[PDB]
Amino acid sequence: MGSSHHHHHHSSGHMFKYEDIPADYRDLMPPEARDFLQNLSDGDKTVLKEVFKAGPYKNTEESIAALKKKSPELGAKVEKLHAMVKSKIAALGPEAKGFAEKSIEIARGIKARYYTGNEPTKDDLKASVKEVLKLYKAMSDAGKADFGKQFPFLAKVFESGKAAKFAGEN
């Protein structure tokens, strides 16, 4: 008698799959930030949530550090990825930089709560891009265009309104 006569698996079955994310929204994220969850598999995904649910991190480098401790290579995998991103945001002006290191915080948070097991509903993602538009619409034109140099892929979908049709137009 016992739980053996009940369902099996409860805390070892749920696993984030990048293929299960609303593809409309995966279109709204940079290809570089996709390559990672293209290549990243179950075993490593498992440890992301350990870093996330522990925290807290005033910066992503703390998470990179935590990842280097828990999964050495994985920390390097996220490092190189985030480093490139930083290199571009480094080339970004104050206005667009403020948007970058805040909109990505939203976008990353979505696929970060995918890691944790707190999978967002379809309407949660709307909220995500909604604020990036709330910010991006409010930026000065020159700053909006300058964001298109450091992150052309995102500027693309923002100008075309692809993200707009996702948020419900800001």
From TrEMBL:
Location in the cell: Secreted
Record-annotated membrane-spanning stretches: none
A Pfam family annotated for this UniProt entry: Gp-FAR-1
Molecular function GO terms recorded: lipid binding
InterPro entries: Gp-FAR-1
PANTHER family (alphabetical): FATTY-ACID AND RETINOL-BINDING PROTEIN 1
Protein name as annotated: Fatty-acid and retinol-binding protein 1
